[PDB]
Design a protein around this ligand. Structure first.
Ligand SMILES: Cc1n[nH]c(=O)nc1Nc1ccc(C(C)C)cc1
Ligand SMILES: [Cl-]
Ligand SMILES: [Cl-]
Ligand SMILES: [Cl-]
Ligand SMILES: [Cl-]
Ligand SMILES: [Mg+2]
Length: 346
């Protein structure tokens, strides 16, 4: 066990190992401090979870986040540098701290403030798809891909962060909000179950924005956004309509005048024809027909970065706990076990 020291920063007590120095507050899930890690020499983000075991839903969400972060070991995905508690036994266990690499800019900071060449777009989207190939190979769905969840450094290197933990609420998705602008239309009103093709829709929305500098579907509400989407990609054809099982979806959809898919070369004026072709393969209304991450890596648009010997897959990830029903103390004890079994990376 390391030695811990205590301090109060903005009305919160932080009790952390001596290896973490120069804590500075940075920003409902918890409070975050930037710090210097004297073991690894990295600047890190230290998050103290708020009330991690207050309810069954909260205790299970704490376990979910910790299991997910412990699993991710990929250059283009946020990983777990450390996890700790000041408790010396399960019986006094109450607080959980998570440590990750500190992130400077996100893709928002860059999209708003840079002139991006086609070469910049190629490299940024290539890295998203390389990380997504890894995530999807473990049968994980991110669910919340958007520019503020992509970290980028001065060398244009990118990491995916902030996995959807089933945390976003109804009010968080209401109105003119970036929280919803990147979500696939078949899940915006829960007409279909979540599946990994929804992440590819989000990548298409991000790629379009990098190309034009503008949000692709900046809807003022769920319905306005659906209208923007259907104008670009068309209303459902007969083949897709056969597959639509939600009666709610069918009733409303059939009230809309039919529209053809638009010509993407007239929407994304001046873009590389290969980037237009890839966008057409991501932004397909029928999610069965969307390109996958593994398929997209072999698209000609990435010819200068694609290396099939350096695009690795993940160890299998056991998610059986998601269908399990336990008490608070049992979720809490499973979380304690994962804290004390953590082994740092090399
Ligand atoms: C592919 C698919 N499979 N099953 C289903 O129930 N619904 C599906 N797609 C679907 C596509 C679009 C829409 C709205 C956005 C027009 C709804 C369902
Ligand atoms: Cl220490
Ligand atoms: Cl504690
Ligand atoms: Cl965002
Ligand atoms: Cl596992
Ligand atoms: Mg975020």
């Amino acid at each position: 066990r390391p030695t811990f020291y205590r301090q109060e920063l903005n009305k919160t007590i932080w009790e952390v190992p001596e290896r973490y120095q120069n804590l500075s507050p940075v920003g409902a899930y918890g409070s975050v401090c930037a710090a210097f890690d004297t073991k690894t020499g990295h600047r890190v983000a230290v998050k103290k979870l708020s009330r991690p075991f207050q309810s069954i839903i909260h205790a299970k969400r704490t376990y979910r986040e910790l299991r997910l972060l412990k699993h991710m070991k990929h250059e283009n995905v946020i990983g777990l540098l450390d996890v700790f508690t000041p408790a010396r036994s399960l019986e006094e266990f109450n607080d959980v701290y998570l440590v990750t690499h500190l992130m400077g800019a996100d893709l928002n900071n860059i999209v708003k403030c840079q002139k991006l060449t086609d070469d910049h777009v190629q490299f940024l989207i290539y890295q998203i798809l390389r990380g997504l190939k890894y995530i999807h190979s473990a049968d994980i769905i991110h669910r919340d891909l958007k520019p503020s969840n992509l970290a980028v450094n001065e060398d244009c290197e990118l990491k995916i962060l902030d996995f959807g933990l089933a945390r976003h609420t109804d009010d968080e998705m209401t109105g003119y909000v970036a929280t919803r602008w990147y979500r696939a239309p078949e899940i915006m009103l829960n007409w279909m179950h979540y599946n990994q093709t929804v992440d590819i829709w989000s990548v298409g929305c991000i790629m379009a924005e990098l190309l034009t500098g503008r949000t692709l579907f900046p809807g003022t509400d769920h319905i306005d956004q659906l209208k923007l989407i259907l104008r670009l990609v068309g209303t459902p054809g007969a083949e897709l309509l056969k597959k639509i099982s939600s009666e709610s979806a069918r009733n409303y959809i059939q009230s809309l005048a039919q529209m053809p898919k638009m010509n993407f070369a007239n929407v994304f004026i001046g873009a590389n024809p290969l980037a237009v072709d890839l966008l057409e393969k991501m932004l397909v209304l029928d999610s069965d027909k969307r390109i996958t991450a593994a398929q997209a890596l072999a698209h000609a648009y990435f010819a200068q970065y694609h290396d099939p010997d350096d695009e690795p897959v993940a160890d299998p990830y056991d998610q059986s706990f998601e269908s399990r029903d336990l008490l608070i103390d049992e979720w809490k004890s499973l979380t304690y076990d994962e804290v004390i079994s953590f082994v740092p990376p090399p």
